[PDB]
């Protein structure tokens, strides 16, 4: 898979964009799903609008042809959405065009075939009816998990994109529920948050990085996925966020050997909701949202723009896992994730970052 380093660098630029905006808010998104969403949308666009999207998704058009990109994305969607997939995630993309627009079939069918997404037709004249139709589709798609995603629609909304993703993975090495107890999470020097802290003594692929000045924990999910947590040292979060590059992450993933440790990891449920129009606008994706948008591939009768693009990622880190291990005699280091930390979810075989985020406060819904 040759598109991974682009998704990786797209993830970091998208992350640092959000980290630059807010200092003390939870960051959590899926750069794979977001990229997929707009890689799929790239079929409907043409000319400069088409070029602006991919280049904004961190793809040099000359270095990697679009024909090769789209199948590269399809290979991920194939890997994620499998039969008997123990990843246990429900990602899905929903297009919502206004009834009356004569839609191009070429686009619609490639949305279903190449990207396994699904487009719908809705009456945007009725705002509340549309809002419900969007959120019910998401509620349907996420098995009732994500609800009331779209809080508002514009009066002249013509084409709305919505990209949800839920993930409740199980660890290869579970934490004990009895061990989990209430502990303080130091969000900053003043704010302190009581959180259910999971904790297990055992062998973890955990190493204190000197390059990042951070404790770097790696935990294998059940099924082909891995969770990399980065716990920065005292006042090194800024340093950490800057120093992270795909070359560095891969350098940790390929490290296998473990170390005995007394880990404190917070049980949490974080949701990141993002107006992609606003967020990707900062990264460079702007013309598709503008009036002069080349969406002739979607519909060629009337002019069109992507009037709304929303994304909501939901994570559930909890103690549950699968159904031996020997610990050395030495005193294990007590690595506590009680202060804000960055983390990624990487798909094992493609090495693509499903999720990325920073926990500022676990109780922040
Ligand atoms: C990853 O999944 C493949 C099948 O999709 C399996 O053969 C392999 O053992 C898995 N590897 C790990 C490390 O989970």
Numbering used by the authors: 24 to 346, 353 to 394
Sentences from the paper on this structure:
To further understand the conformation of Z α1-AT, we carried out crystallization screens on various α1-AT mutants expressed in E. coli and on glycosylated Z α1-AT expressed in Drosophila cells. Only crystals from glycosylated recombinant Z α1-AT yielded a good diffraction data set at 3.3 Å, and the structure was solved by molecular replacement. Unexpectedly, the overall structure of Z α1-AT largely resembles that of wild type with a closed 5-stranded β-sheet A and a fully exposed reactive center loop. Although the overall resolution of the structure is modest, the electron density map around Lys-342 is unambiguous as shown in Fig. 5b. It appears that the positively charged side chain has a minimal effect on overall packing around the hinge region of Z α1-AT. Nevertheless, superposition of wild type α1-AT with that of Z α1-AT reveals subtle differences between Z and wild type α1-AT, with a change in orientation of the reactive loop and a slight shift of s5A at the top half of β-sheet A. The reactive loop of Z α1-AT is fully extended, and in the wild type α1-AT structure and most other inhibitory serpins the reactive center loop characteristically takes a U turn around P17 and P16 with residues P15 and P14 poised to enter the central β-sheet. Close inspection of crystal packing reveals that the P13 and P12 residues of the reactive loop from one Z α1-AT molecule are packed against either hH or hE from a symmetry-related molecule. It is likely that both the crystal packing and the increased flexibility around s5A allow Z α1-AT to crystallize in a native-like conformation with a relatively extended reactive loop. As Z α1-AT is largely active, it must have the ability to adopt a normal inhibitory conformation for protease inhibition as seen in its crystal structure shown here. This structure of Z α1-AT allows us to propose that Z α1-AT has a labile s5A and equilibrates between a native inhibitory conformation as shown in its crystal structure and an aberrant conformation with s5A only partially incorporated into the central β-sheet.
Serpins (1–3) are folded into a metastable conformation with a surface-exposed reactive center loop. Once the reactive loop is recognized and cleaved by the target protease, a dramatic conformational change occurs, with the incorporation of the reactive loop into the middle of the central β-sheet A and a translocation and inactivation of the covalently linked protease. The Z mutation (E342K) of α1-antitrypsin (α1-AT),4 carried by 4% of Northern Europeans, predisposes to the early onset of emphysema due to decreased functional α1-AT in the lung and to liver cirrhosis due to accumulation of α1-AT polymers in the endoplasmic reticulum of hepatocytes. Glu-342 is located at the top of strand 5 of central β-sheet A (s5A) in the P17 position (active site residue termed P1) at the base of the reactive center loop and forms a highly conserved salt bridge to Lys-290 and a hydrogen bond to Thr-203.
